[PDB]
Amino acid sequence: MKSTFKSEYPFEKRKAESERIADRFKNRIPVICEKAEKSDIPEIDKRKYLVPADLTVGQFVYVIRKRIMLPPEKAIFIFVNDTLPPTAALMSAIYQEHKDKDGFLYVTYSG
């Protein structure tokens, strides 16, 4: 049994969120950021992020970093459907290309 975001809320309730957000926030992309299933680094229970269209991967990664007090020495990586996007990539671009049918964009992190 999974302990993810999809597994915690049903499709219909998830999409409900996507829409209210796309409604009450014009320039924001709703992101679900979860820890890589078999990764070792710390797991945060805060996974819902409202990100600006111009936010970059590199910047998003920096955020998750501080959030889980990652030793700058240690590494962390963000994935979008098995794809490791380049740090210059803008989240808006990634959203158009990979948003889930529920309305969210699912990202994953690890080391």
């Binding site: 924001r28 805060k46 819902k48 992020y49 409202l50 990100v51 600006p52 936010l55 910047q59 998003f60 955020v63």
Partner: peptide, 4 residues
């Protein structure tokens, strides 16, 4: 939610 967290606004980044």
């Amino acid at each position: 939610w967290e606004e980044l």
